[PDB]
Scaffold this active site. Structure first.
Site, PDB file in Angstrom:
ATOM      1  N   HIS A  68      37.745  59.590  46.346  1.00 17.13           N
ATOM      2  CA  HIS A  68      38.271  60.911  45.711  1.00 17.13           C
ATOM      3  C   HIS A  68      39.247  61.585  46.631  1.00 17.13           C
ATOM      4  CE1 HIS A  68      34.641  60.495  42.404  1.00 17.13           C
ATOM      5  NE2 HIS A  68      35.468  61.231  42.161  1.00 17.13           N
ATOM      6  N   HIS A 106      43.388  66.931  39.893  1.00 16.14           N
ATOM      7  CA  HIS A 106      42.233  67.292  39.114  1.00 16.14           C
ATOM      8  C   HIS A 106      40.987  67.182  39.981  1.00 16.14           C
ATOM      9  CE1 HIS A 106      42.185  63.138  39.371  1.00 16.14           C
ATOM     10  NE2 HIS A 106      40.887  63.190  38.697  1.00 16.14           N
ATOM     11  N   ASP A 107      41.026  66.783  41.502  1.00 14.59           N
ATOM     12  CA  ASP A 107      39.929  66.587  41.898  1.00 14.59           C
ATOM     13  C   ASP A 107      40.700  67.080  43.234  1.00 14.59           C
ATOM     14  OD1 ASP A 107      38.190  65.516  40.505  1.00 14.59           O
ATOM     15  OD2 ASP A 107      39.218  63.754  41.163  1.00 14.59           O
ATOM     16  N   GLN A 269      27.723  48.590  35.872  1.00 12.17           N
ATOM     17  CA  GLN A 269      28.732  48.107  35.897  1.00 12.17           C
ATOM     18  C   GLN A 269      28.866  48.767  34.413  1.00 12.17           C
ATOM     19  OE1 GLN A 269      32.111  48.863  37.416  1.00 12.17           O
ATOM     20  NE2 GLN A 269      30.466  50.112  39.210  1.00 12.17           N
TER      21      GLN A 269
HETATM   22  C1  LIG Z   1      34.056  57.641  40.169  1.00 14.57           C
HETATM   23  C2  LIG Z   1      33.311  58.233  39.665  1.00 14.57           C
HETATM   24  C3  LIG Z   1      32.856  60.000  39.668  1.00 14.57           C
HETATM   25  C4  LIG Z   1      33.202  58.297  38.044  1.00 14.57           C
HETATM   26  N1  LIG Z   1      33.543  56.755  37.401  1.00 14.57           N
HETATM   27  N2  LIG Z   1      34.562  56.596  37.703  1.00 14.57           N
HETATM   28  C5  LIG Z   1      35.717  55.570  37.487  1.00 14.57           C
HETATM   29  C6  LIG Z   1      33.893  54.657  37.672  1.00 14.57           C
HETATM   30 CL1  LIG Z   1      33.985  52.912  37.147  1.00 14.57          CL
HETATM   31  C7  LIG Z   1      33.339  56.037  37.442  1.00 14.57           C
HETATM   32  C8  LIG Z   1      31.528  55.006  37.589  1.00 14.57           C
HETATM   33  O1  LIG Z   1      31.544  56.781  37.313  1.00 14.57           O
HETATM   34  N3  LIG Z   1      31.128  54.408  37.688  1.00 14.57           N
HETATM   35  C9  LIG Z   1      29.749  53.920  37.959  1.00 14.57           C
HETATM   36  C10 LIG Z   1      28.849  53.760  37.209  1.00 14.57           C
HETATM   37  C11 LIG Z   1      27.618  54.666  36.422  1.00 14.57           C
HETATM   38  C12 LIG Z   1      27.153  53.090  37.332  1.00 14.57           C
HETATM   39  N4  LIG Z   1      25.955  52.996  37.334  1.00 14.57           N
HETATM   40  C13 LIG Z   1      25.887  52.462  38.849  1.00 14.57           C
HETATM   41  C14 LIG Z   1      24.531  51.894  39.084  1.00 14.57           C
HETATM   42  C15 LIG Z   1      23.126  51.598  38.324  1.00 14.57           C
HETATM   43  C16 LIG Z   1      22.047  50.937  39.076  1.00 14.57           C
HETATM   44  C17 LIG Z   1      21.932  50.358  40.104  1.00 14.57           C
HETATM   45  C18 LIG Z   1      23.328  49.913  40.653  1.00 14.57           C
HETATM   46  C19 LIG Z   1      24.565  50.925  40.453  1.00 14.57           C
HETATM   47  N5  LIG Z   1      26.753  51.797  39.135  1.00 14.57           N
HETATM   48  C20 LIG Z   1      27.972  52.282  38.259  1.00 14.57           C
HETATM   49  C21 LIG Z   1      29.322  52.894  38.584  1.00 14.57           C
HETATM   50 MG   LIG Z   2      36.454  65.169  39.105  1.00 15.07          MG
HETATM   51 ZN   LIG Z   3      39.061  62.169  39.355  1.00 16.72          ZN
END
Ligand SMILES: CC(C)Cn1ncc(Cl)c1C(=O)Nc1ccc2nc(-c3ccccc3)[nH]c2c1
Ligand SMILES: [Mg+2]
Ligand SMILES: [Zn+2]
Ligand SMILES: [Cl-]
Length: 313
Positions: A68, A106-107, A269
């Site tokens: 961020h 925005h951040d 993911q």
């Molecule tokens: C920067 C952020 C605030 C928002 N963002 N921007 C881009 C992207 Cl991609 C994302 C994002 O949220 N990615 C994301 C979302 C939900 C997930 N759940 C897991 C997970 C679950 C169980 C075990 C291990 C991992 N990993 C994750 C990664």
């Molecule tokens: Mg944000």
């Molecule tokens: Zn952002």
């Protein structure tokens, strides 16, 4: 006034594409932003001296966090640039102006921690802003910088136009609270499917701009695979640090923030692409057909994560 920003030929060409990566040269990012403002808005939209002073003050108010950071700010602005350039006639002069600035800001002053961690820590911002905690902070920081001497890029606006652009920016920045995205996309899906969607209805436009903000904010999932994969490392560096800080408060973090559950990243993911990213770009493509390359890039990255699970990488 007859002063254009120009880019090297490869950047001049690739900046027009949704999947453009702004590169590792930090000193080129301000010029890349001004270039996009000039093409998206006009060389007249802002006084160059005020714009450059605004950009450098915004940069200074992004922190040295893994994800961020200032690079994220310019990256999200570029995705907005690409949406606006591919939807030439759909947006007003004020909206073009407001939305690139909203994306850059925005951040602002992000610490690498979620609204949920601020709440559990009992951070002062969580008492000031009960919902969309960091997003209300980011908007507050945007207004503070605009009010610095010589930083009011919106000075030539009429009083009514000024009030409209700050309201576009406020709504656009609050919309980056992912907690609000689920209900926003559901409403837009219903409106599109029943044919009630009306871009002359301000409350409908607000919703469409909100979805554009989610789409630009998540745009790391729309890059070529090597960029997507390397960006995921920066995102997890923040998540795992937040998880460490949850353990210090005596709270077991959710798996996505637990560095001990690294092995479950590929499946995590998959959930994110299926529950958030793909639906986001699908509804965006329905409303704004020229944004289809974002949905295509997202599906390509979904299939790469599927290949990682199958041990093909
Ligand atoms: C920067 C952020 C605030 C928002 N963002 N921007 C881009 C992207 Cl991609 C994302 C994002 O949220 N990615 C994301 C979302 C939900 C997930 N759940 C897991 C997970 C679950 C169980 C075990 C291990 C991992 N990993 C994750 C990664
Ligand atoms: Mg944000
Ligand atoms: Zn952002
Ligand atoms: Cl143009």
């Amino acid at each position: 006034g007859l002063m254009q920003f120009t880019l090297p030929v490869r950047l001049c060409k690739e900046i027009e594409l949704f999947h453009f990566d702004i590169g590792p040269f930090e000193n080129m990012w301000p010029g890349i932003f001004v270039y996009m403002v000039h093409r998206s808005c006009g060389t007249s939209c802002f006084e160059l001296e005020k714009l450059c002073r605004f950009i450098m003050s915004v940069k200074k108010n992004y922190r040295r966090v893994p994800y961020h950071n200032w690079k994220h700010a310019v990256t999200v602005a570029h995705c907005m640039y690409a949406i606006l350039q591919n939807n030439h006639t759909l947006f007003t002069d004020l909206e073009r102006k407001g939305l690139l600035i909203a994306c850059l800001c925005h951040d602002l002053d992000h610490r690498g921690f979620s609204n949920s961690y601020l709440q559990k820590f009992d951070h002062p911002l969580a008492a000031l802003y009960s919902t969309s905690t960091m997003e209300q902070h980011h908007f507050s920081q945007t207004v503070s910088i605009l009010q610095l001497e010589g930083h009011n890029i919106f000075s030539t606006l009429s009083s009514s136009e000024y009030e409209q652009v700050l309201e576009i920016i406020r709504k656009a920045i609050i919309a980056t609270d992912l907690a609000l995205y689920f209900g926003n996309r559901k409403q837009l899906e219903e409106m599109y499917q029943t044919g009630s969607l009306n871009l002359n209805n301000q409350s409908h436009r607000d919703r469409v701009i909100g979805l554009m903000m989610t789409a630009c904010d998540l745009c790391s999932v729309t890059k070529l695979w090597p960029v997507t994969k390397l960006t995921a490392n920066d995102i997890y560096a923040e998540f795992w640090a937040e998880g460490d800080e949850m353990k210090k408060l005596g709270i077991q973090p959710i798996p996505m923030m637990d560095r001990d559950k690294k092995d479950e990243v590929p499946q995590g993911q998959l959930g994110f692409y299926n529950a958030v990213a793909i639906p986001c770009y699908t509804t965006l493509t329905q409303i704004l057909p020229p944004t289809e390359p974002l949905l295509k890039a997202c599906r390509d990255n979904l299939s790469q994560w599927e290949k990682v699970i199958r041990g093909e990488e």
